[PDB]
Amino acid sequence: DKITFLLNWQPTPYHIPIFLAQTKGYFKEQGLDMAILEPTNPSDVTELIGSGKVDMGLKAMIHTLAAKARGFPVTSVASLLDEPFTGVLYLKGSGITKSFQSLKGKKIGYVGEFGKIQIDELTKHYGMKPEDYTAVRCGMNVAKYIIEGKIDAGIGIECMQQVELEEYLAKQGRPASDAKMLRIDKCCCFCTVLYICNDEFLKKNPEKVRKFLKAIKKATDYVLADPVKAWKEYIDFKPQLNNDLSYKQYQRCYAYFSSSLYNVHRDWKKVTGYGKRLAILPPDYVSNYTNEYLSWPEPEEVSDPLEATRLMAIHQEKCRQEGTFKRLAL
Amino acid sequence: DKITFLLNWQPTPYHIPIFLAQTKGYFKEQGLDMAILEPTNPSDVTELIGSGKVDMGLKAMIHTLAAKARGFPVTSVASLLDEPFTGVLYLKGSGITKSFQSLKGKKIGYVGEFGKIQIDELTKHYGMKPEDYTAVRCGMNVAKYIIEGKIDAGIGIECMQQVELEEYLAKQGRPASDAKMLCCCFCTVLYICNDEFLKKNPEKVRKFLKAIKKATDYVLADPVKAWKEYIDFKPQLNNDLSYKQYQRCYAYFSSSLYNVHRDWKKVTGYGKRLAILPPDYVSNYTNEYLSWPEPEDPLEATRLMAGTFKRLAL
Ligand SMILES: *Cc1c(COP(=O)(O)O)cnc(C)c1O
């Protein structure tokens, strides 16, 4: 009678609120017995949770959408990481440029099936065809394969893959600015990371989920309030994250953590749109999320979302060169 | 309709045969879709597999025995790592010595549950009581906590924890010999199934072990190419520590995957004496799902076993 929680990824700096809810005894104090699991292949995640083999976990906004469409009943009950910049990453002199036309004849890596689906469709809007470029499945190793020259560019998150590149560049004495991203946003909300449940599990255990999120909230607060003490506890438990790369990633993640855990309606709306257009989702498809199991007031919708996004881009650039923990102010 | 396989630990060098069976397409070529999972806490493992939430996994012989006793129906269907030396590891100048009496007043780390039970019971055979010593649960971090001085000694495997200590010693300029250890079959690592799953899918398990066998062969035949593939997929293992661990593991890999009857017999005994197992308890393993012939002085082989890749010769 343990509850299974399956991450989207190998342990990352942004899983901290979950591991801490464990180590600090927050889950225990709620009468929950959580069995946190890590996947070897993110591709396995939605299917396992949808099929009820696993009770809860995390995945990106899009995959959560595509999961129900593809027949796996999952519902997003909370939000972990909000709108992290996603895009095609590449090193300067790849030789790739700001023009999506440079992707011609290049090997471009992706993790998920959907990353291919995304690139495949972008090629049409720029005159080229799949395939005037080679798509390579790289799973959790996109950045790594970039650095080793097995691919020319690949899909990733600004606060994970991009950092891994910058740290590599620092070794080569190159400047961090040489790590570049063609943003798919320029709705970067596709890679928002969500707390998801099996629909059936949620139906039968509403109160346990509510309690789960209470524990998650308590830890999320701690992490945002005192990121440094938090980080020390985290890496004491998960030493594989006790390196400089992981810490820099952690700092870049700080500004993207959701403080409220609320699903953002606007974002879901946008991505569901994207989803229908890409043919990933049926015409009558309905967004599979809910804020019902959150036990604190919803925050006010961001007044000007597109300015907050270009403000974040700046904020994150400052984080890179100052090495700080600051929340984006509005 | 994926099959879930849950490892006993974070990815380790000795999981190589499984990951390779995945990356090399051996599972695929058997029409199996395996979802390999890694636990955050080894202790969660047998309960998850026993309860059917997870189909298959790895766990150590003692755990697998105690699992059925404790009400979780699992069956060992094959063997991954045979009789790795297990014991209490400590650094010279701990100050701990060959005499178990030195454990008095020391902080002693154990991984989850069974280690405390083991130490607790050893203290009686040497005149001391639980607790003339402090037991500390360390999970997958025993060696790490030893190095940092949070504990004085802790329970571990010669080819994993001990190596982690030796590598630390090399950094301090100390000699490897300064890493010391006080039926070592209790920590044999097994391929286990949920009893119900095995009942309903006998042929898939048989095919699973075929894939595992193919990869195990490759690993033993050409350990170096194997290792390169493994760490290409799992970069966290691409370091010198992991490679040294890998080399120490090489001699312990089971080439045949067969459960060893003698070993199970011994540990079941141990199990009953420790009260972990009921009096009428019956060993929960089987070689039925292996599809190749079973192989033919155990105590001399053990003292014979005590930077190369060589199999122990007999
Ligand atoms: C479960 C496990 C352990 C330890 O748990 P204890 O109950 O303390 O023994 C140790 N090693 C492996 C490989 C395990 O799977």
* Biggest alpha carbon–alpha carbon distance for chain B: 57
According to CATH, the topology of domain B84-185 is D-Maltodextrin-Binding Protein; domain 2 (3.40.190)
Would residue A63 show up in a list of annotated catalytic residues for this protein? yes
Atom of ligand 1 nearest to the CA of B8: 15
The torsion angles phi and psi of A264, rounded to 5 degrees, stand at -90, 115
- What backbone phi and psi angles, to 5 degrees, belong to A271? -65, -35
* Residues B4, A53: C-beta atoms closer than 8 Å: yes
CA B295 to chain centre: 21
Bridge partners of B285, per DSSP, are B76
Angle between the B202-221 and B16-23 helix axes, to the nearest 10 degrees?
100
Binding residues of B: 112-115
Spell out the long-range contacts of A66-72 with Cβ–Cβ below 8 A and sequence spacing 24 or more.
A66/A114, A66/A275, A66/A280, A66/A281, A67/A196, A67/A288, A68/A285, A68/A288, A69/A275, A69/A280, A69/A281, A69/A282, A69/A285, A70/A46, A72/A46, A72/A47
Say how far apart CA A77 and CA A80 lie, in whole Å. 10
| Dihedrals phi, psi of A108, to nearest 5 degrees | -120, 120
Domain A1-83+190-330 sits in CATH at 3.40.190.10
Fold of B1-83+186-314: D-Maltodextrin-Binding Protein; domain 2 (3.40.190)
DSSP state letter for A28:
G
Q: What are phi and psi of B76, to 5 degrees?
A: -75, 125
Report how far apart, in Å, the C-alpha atoms of A146 and of each of A74, A92, A95, A150, A295 are.
Answer: 33, 12, 12, 6, 43
The C-alpha atoms of residue B231 and residue B229 are separated, in whole angstroms, by 6
Q: Residue A155 and residue A90: Cα distance in Å, rounded?
A: 9
A84-189: CATH number: 3.40.190.10
Name the helix (H) or strand (E) containing A39.
Answer: strand A34-39
Residues sharing a CB contact under 8 Å with residue B214, sequence separation 6 or more, in sequence order: B21, B26
H/E segment holding residue A119? helix A113-122
**Closest Cα partner for A70 from A259, A278, A252?**
A278
Inspect the interface and report whether the beta carbons of B22 and A44 lie closer than 8 Å.
Answer: no
Same fold, A1-83+190-330 and A84-189: yes
Using CB atoms within 10 Å of the CB of residue A94, give its burial: 0 to 12 exposed, 13 to 18 middle, 19+ buried: middle
Closest chain A residue to the Cα of B36, Cα to Cα = A40
> What backbone phi and psi angles, to 5 degrees, belong to A151?
-135, 165
- List the domain boundaries for chain B: 1-83+186-314, 84-185
Q: Is B91 helix (H, G, I), strand (E, B) or coil?
A: strand
Which residues 6+ apart lie within 8 Å of A238 measured at CB? A11, A19
Structure tokens at B25: 């397409």
- Both tokens of B221, joined, read 């035949």
Rg (CA), chain A: 19
In chain B, residues with a C-beta closer than 8 Å to the C-beta of A38 are: 37-40
| b/e burial code for range B13-52 (CB count within 10 A of at least 16 → b) | bbbbbbbbbbbbebbeebebebbbbbbbbbbbbbbbbbbe
Data resolution in angstroms: 2.9
Query: Residue A322, Cβ neighbours under 10 Å: how many?
Result: 10
First-to-last alpha carbon distance for chain B, in angstroms, is 44
DSSP state of B41: -
Q: Which two tokens stand for residue B135?
A: 């037991």
Contact B44 A6 (CB under 8 A): no
How many C-beta neighbours within 10 Å does residue B63 have?
A: 25
Residue A71: burial class (beta carbons within 10 Å; 0-12, 13-18, 19+): exposed
Q: Which of B187, B273, B258 is nearest to B12 (CA)?
A: B187
Chain B: residue nearest A142 by CA? B233
Q: Is A46 helix (H, G, I), strand (E, B) or coil?
A: helix
What backbone phi and psi angles, to 5 degrees, belong to A62? -65, -45
Q: Dihedral sign, CA of B220, B221, B223, B227?
A: negative
DSSP B256-299: S----HHHHHHHHHHHHHTTSS-TT----B--TT--SPPP--HH
CA A120 – CA A2 distance, rounded (Å)? 41
Residue with tokens 């009942």: B199
